[PDB]
C-alpha cells in the first residue's frame, strides 16, 4: 500500500464534510478514506491509477494549487432554485451508492461540488438526490472526473480550446454554426494551466521528466521502531508516514537521521549512524508536460471527461455540376470532327440510333471519328461521349447535322 503515502499534506477531505478527519486528514497506510479509496479500485480511474503519485483534486485544492469556485458548493438543500447545476448536467457520470457529495473541476479551472441535503444520497447519474431509510452515508465526496494535478508556474493565459469541426464542447461555445448539428456524448481529454480556463484537447501527447524535489520521494518509518515516533510495543507490523522536510539536504542541516536508496543518497545526505526513516524514490513522480499546439507546456491539472459535443458533419459533401459547352462539333466529309477548346481529347465514342463508333488518339484539342452507320447519309442527331483530361466538363454532347453527300467523301 505504498500509494497511501501522499505527496504534500495529503488532505483528501472537502470543506463541510469534516467527519472523517481521523483518516482523511493526512492519508496514511492505516485508515480508510471514502473520498480516496474509490480512486484505487481496479478498473476505475485508470488515468490517475497510472499517475498514482500525483496530487488528486482535493489535495491540489488544499495545497492552494487549485482555487475554489464561487459558491464553492451551493447546497441543493438551500440553493436548488439557483442556476448551479449547469456544468454538472452536461457531464455523464456514474456515482456509487450512499454518497452525499461529489466534487468536480468546473469550467473556470476551480473545484466545485454538489452536496445533497442531509440523509439524502446521489443517484446513479449523480443528477438527483434520493432518500433511503436506515442507510449510512459515506463521509467523503466522490471524485467525478478522472484527473491528476501538480504544481506549475508555467503561464497559460493565452491558452484556449482549439477543436476542429466542433461548434460546442461541454459548456464552452466554440463558435456559431447553422444547419446540421451532430450532438453526442464523447470522452474529451482536457487540461488546466495557470491563469487560464479548461482547455479541451483533440489529442493527449504528454511526457514525464524526473527530478529530485521533495515531492518525488516516499519517506516512511516503522511502528514500534527503536528511537522513532511511536516507540512502543506493537501487536502488528505496520508502516507510518515520514516528513522528508526533516532529513537534511546534502551539505546542510537537518533534525533527523535519514537513509534511503541511490537517488535519495545522491540528492540528500544519507547518514552513517542509525537512521530514523527510509526514503525511497517514487515509481513515476516528476513533472508532466502536455503538448498543446505543437509546443510543450506545464499544466496545473490533466484529466478526461464525458461531455456533450456538437459537431458539424458537413456543409456540402461534394458539388458536381458541369454544363460545359466549350467545344465545336461539325460533321465533315473526311470524318466527324470535334475541336475541344482547352481540354484535350484522347478517346471518344459517337452513338446514333443504337450503332456506335469509337476512336482513340493522343490527347489533343480535336478528334475525328468515322460516322456511325447511315447517320452520315441520314443526318440527324448524334451523341458524343468523350474523355477529357480536365474535370468539370460535360462528357455527353449532341451534334445536329443535315444529310451529307458521300460523293465528296469517296471522290477520287
Amino acid at each position: 500500500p505504498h500509494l497511501r503515502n501522499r505527496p504534500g499534506k495529503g488532505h483528501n477531505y472537502i470543506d463541510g464534510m469534516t467527519q472523517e478527519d481521523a483518516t482523511c486528514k493526512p492519508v496514511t497506510y492505516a485508515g480508510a478514506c471514502s473520498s480516496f479509496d474509490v480512486l484505487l479500485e481496479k478498473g476505475k480511474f485508470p488515468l490517475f491509477q497510472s499517475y498514482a503519485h500525483h496530487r488528486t483534486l482535493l489535495e491540489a485544492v488544499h495545497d492552494t494549487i487549485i482555487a475554489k469556485a464561487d459558491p464553492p458548493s451551493c447546497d441543493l438543500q438551500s440553493a436548488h432554485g439557483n442556476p448551479c447545476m449547469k456544468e454538472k448536467l452536461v457531464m455523464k457520470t456514474h456515482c456509487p451508492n450512499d454518497y452525499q457529495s461529489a466534487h468536480y473541476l468546473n469550467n473556470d479551472g476551480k473545484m466545485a461540488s454538489v452536496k445533497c441535503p442531509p440523509k439524502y444520497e446521489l443517484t446513479e447519474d449523480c443528477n438527483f438526490c434520493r432518500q433511503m431509510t436506515g442507510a449510512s452515508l459515506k463521509k467523503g465526496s466522490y471524485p467525478l472526473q478522472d484527473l491528476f494535478c501538480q504544481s506549475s508556474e508555467d503561464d497559460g493565459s493565452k491558452l484556449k480550446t482549439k477543436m476542429k469541426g466542433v461548434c460546442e464542447v461541454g459548456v464552452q461555445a466554440l463558435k456559431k454554426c447553422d444547419g446540421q448539428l451532430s450532438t453526442a456524448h464523447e470522452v474529451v481529454p482536457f487540461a488546466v494551466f495557470k491563469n487560464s480556463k479548461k482547455v479541451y484537447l483533440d489529442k493527449l501527447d504528454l511526457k514525464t521528466e524526473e527530478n529530485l524535489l521533495p515531492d518525488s520521494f516516499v519517506c516512511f518509518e516503522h511502528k514500534g521502531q527503536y528511537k522513532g515516533t511511536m516507540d512502543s510495543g506493537q501487536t502488528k507490523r505496520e508502516l507510518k508516514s515520514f516528513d522528508i522536510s526533516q532529513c537534511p539536504k546534502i551539505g546542510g542541516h537537518g533534525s533527523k537521521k535519514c537513509t534511503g536508496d541511490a537517488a535519495f543518497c545522491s540528492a540528500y545526505e544519507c547518514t552513517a549512524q542509525y537512521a530514523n526513516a527510509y526514503c525511497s524514490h517514487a515509481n513515476g513522480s516528476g513533472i508532466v508536460q502536455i503538448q498543446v499546439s505543437g509546443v510543450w507546456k506545464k499544466p496545473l491539472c490533466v484529466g478526461y471527461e464525458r461531455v456533450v459535443v456538437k459537431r458539424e458533419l458537413s456543409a456540402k459533401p461534394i458539388q458536381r455540376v458541369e454544363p460545359c459547352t466549350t467545344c465545336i462539333t461539325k460533321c465533315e466529309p473526311h470524318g466527324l470532327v470535334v475541336r475541344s477548346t482547352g481540354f484535350k481529347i484522347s478517346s471518344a465514342v459517337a452513338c446514333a440510333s443504337g450503332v456506335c463508333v469509337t476512336g482513340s488518339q493522343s490527347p489533343s484539342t480535336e478528334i475525328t471519328l468515322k460516322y456511325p452507320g447511315i447517320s452520315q447519309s441520314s443526318g440527324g442527331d448524334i451523341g458524343v461521349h468523350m474523355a477529357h483530361d480536365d474535370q468539370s466538363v460535360s462528357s455527353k454532347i449532341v451534334a445536329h447535322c443535315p444529310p451529307q453527300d458521300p460523293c465528296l467523301v469517296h471522290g477520287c
Binding site: 458539388q319 466549350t326 481540354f343 480536365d390 474535370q391 468539370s392
Partner: protein, 444 residues
C-alpha cells in the same frame, strides 16, 4: 500560361471579393529545375497573381522492408571445476547439460537479461588430476556477451524503389512552401490540395543487396542478400530489434548456433570467438558506390538512400480549390527591366537559362510574353536593382525574340539575344524531348 475562366471570381475597388476558386487545374509538371505557371487575370494593370510550382528534384527513394540491428560483442566466461559426485558432477547430468540452465555455483548471477549460455565439460579424474575419485570431474562454464562499443548499426533492404518529386510552391504573396510527394498521391496543402499523377512508372524494380545505417553518421551498402535468419561468418550473426537491445546485449537478440569457441585446457579456460565487425563493413562500403550502373547515394537531408538509374517519367500534377487572394494587392506597381544574357541549349531537358536585371520600386512580378504567346517569362520584382533568372525551352540554335513585358502597369518591349549550344547525343534520329528525366550514371 493557364487561366481559370470557368472558376474565376471578382478578385468592389480595393477590397477583395474572392469566391473560393474551386475549379481544378490540369497542367503538365515542368522538368527538373523548371517551373509550372498559373495565370490569375483580373483587371488590366491590376491583380495578375502568379502561382508557381518549382520542380526541385526527382529522386528514386527506397521503400524499406525488414530490418534489424547489430553491434560489436565480446564474451566473458565464469568457470567452476568440481570433482565427481560433487553437486551435479554426475556424468549423466554432465553430458545432458542444457545450454539455458544455470549451474548452482554461479547463483550470484541469479536472474539476468543478458545473452548467456552454460556448458559442462568432462575432465580428468584421479589423484594426478586433483580428485580422489577416478571418474571424470566436471567444469561448468557460464558465458555472457557484452557490447564493446556504444554504437549500433541498422541493416535493412529495399524491396522496391519509388519515384518521388519535390516541389516548391511559390504561393500567392509568399513562397514559403516546399512539399514532397510520390506517384498517384495528393498532399493537403493550403488553399486545397495538390496531387501528382506520374503515370509513366511508379516503380523501378528491386535489388538483392543490403544497406547499413549508422545514426548520425550516414549509410553504407553491403553486397550480400538480406537474410532473415542469422548465419555464422556473415553479417547480422547476432541481431536484435532495437538499439537498446544491441547496446545492452539483451537476451531477446537472436544469434546463430555455435558462435563461442571454448578452450578447456587444464590450466585456465579460454572463451573466445571471431565475429565480423559490422563497423568495418560499414566503413568499407560508404554510400557513394556504383553497382551495375545504379550509384546508390544518400538522399538530401540524410533521410534515406537513392538510386540513380537511366530513365524518365511523365508528371501531370493537378491543383484543386486553389484560392489564395487578398485585398491589398489592388494597388498598382511599376518596375524597369533590362535583358542580361542567354545561355544553355535547345530541345534539351536541361533547357535554356535567361537572366534579367529588374529595377523596381517595390514588390511585384513580371509577365513578359512573346508575340505568339508561346513563351512566358515570370520573375519577381523587388525594390532597387536585382538580378533574377529563369529557365525556358527553345528549338533553335540562335535566339532573337521580343517579349511584351509589363509589371501590372504600362506595356513595354524587351528584346532578347544570344545563341544556344548544341548537345551531342552521338546518335540522333528525330529529336531528344523535354519530359521529366531522372538522374542517370555515366556508365548507363
Amino acid at each position: 500560361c493557364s487561366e481559370l475562366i470557368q472558376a474565376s471570381s471578382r478578385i468592389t475597388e480595393g477590397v477583395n471579393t474572392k469566391c473560393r476558386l474551386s475549379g481544378t487545374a490540369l497542367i503538365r509538371a515542368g522538368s527538373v529545375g523548371a517551373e509550372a505557371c498559373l495565370m490569375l487575370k483580373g483587371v488590366k494593370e491590376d491583380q495578375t497573381k502568379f502561382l508557381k510550382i518549382k520542380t526541385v528534384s526527382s529522386e528514386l527513394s527506397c521503400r524499406e522492408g525488414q530490418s534489424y540491428w547489430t553491434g560489436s560483442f565480446s564474451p566473458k566466461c565464469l568457470s567452476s571445476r568440481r570433482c565427481h559426485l560433487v553437486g551435479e558432477c554426475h556424468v549423466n547430468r554432465c553430458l545432458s547439460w542444457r545450454d539455458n540452465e544455470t549451474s548452482a555455483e554461479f547463483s550470484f548471477v541469479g536472474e539476468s537479461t543478458t545473452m548467456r549460455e552454460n556448458k559442462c565439460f568432462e575432465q580428468c579424474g584421479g589423484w594426478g588430476c586433483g580428485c580422489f575419485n577416478v571418474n571424470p570431474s566436471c567444469l561448468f562454464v557460464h558465458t555472457y556477451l557484452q557490447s564493446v562499443r556504444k554504437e549500433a548499426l541498422r541493416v535493412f533492404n529495399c524491396i522496391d524503389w519509388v519515384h518521388k518529386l519535390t516541389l516548391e510552391i511559390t504561393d500567392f504573396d509568399g513562397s514559403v512552401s516546399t512539399i514532397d510527394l510520390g506517384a498517384s498521391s495528393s498532399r493537403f496543402t493550403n488553399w486545397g490540395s495538390v496531387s501528382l499523377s506520374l503515370d509513366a512508372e511508379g516503380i523501378s524494380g528491386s535489388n538483392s543487396f543490403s544497406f547499413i545505417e549508422s545514426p548520425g553518421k550516414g549509410y553504407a551498402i553491403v553486397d550480400e542478400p538480406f537474410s532473415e535468419i542469422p548465419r555464422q561468418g556473415f553479417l547480422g550473426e547476432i541481431r536484435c530489434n532495437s538499439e537498446s537491445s544491441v547496446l545492452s546485449a539483451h537476451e531477446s537478440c537472436l544469434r546463430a548456433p555455435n558462435l563461442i569457441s571454448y578452450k578447456p585446457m587444464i590450466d585456465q579456460l579460454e572463451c573466445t570467438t571471431n565475429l565480423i565487425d559490422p563497423f568495418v563493413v560499414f566503413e568499407r562500403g560508404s554510400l557513394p558506390q556504383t553497382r551495375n550502373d545504379k550509384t546508390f547515394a544518400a538522399s538530401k537531408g540524410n533521410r534515406g538512400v537513392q538510386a540513380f538509374s537511366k530513365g524518365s517519367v511523365q508528371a501531370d500534377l493537378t491543383l484543386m480549390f486553389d484560392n489564395f487572394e487578398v485585398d491589398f494587392v489592388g494597388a498598382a506597381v511599376s518596375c524597369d527591366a533590362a535583358f542580361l544574357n542567354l545561355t544553355g541549349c535547345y530541345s534539351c531537358n536541361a533547357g535554356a537559362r535567361v537572366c534579367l536585371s529588374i529595377t523596381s520600386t517595390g514588390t511585384g512580378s513580371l509577365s513578359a510574353h512573346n508575340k505568339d504567346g508561346s513563351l512566358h517569362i515570370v520573375l519577381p520584382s523587388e525594390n532597387g536593382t536585382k538580378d533574377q533568372c529563369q529557365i525556358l525551352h527553345f528549338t533553335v540554335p540562335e535566339v532573337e525574340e521580343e517579349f511584351m513585358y509589363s509589371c501590372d502597369g504600362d506595356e513595354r518591349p524587351l528584346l532578347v539575344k544570344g545563341t544556344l549550344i548544341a548537345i551531342d547525343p552521338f546518335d540522333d534520329r528525330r529529336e531528344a524531348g523535354g519530359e521529366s528525366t531522372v538522374v542517370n550514371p555515366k556508365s548507363g
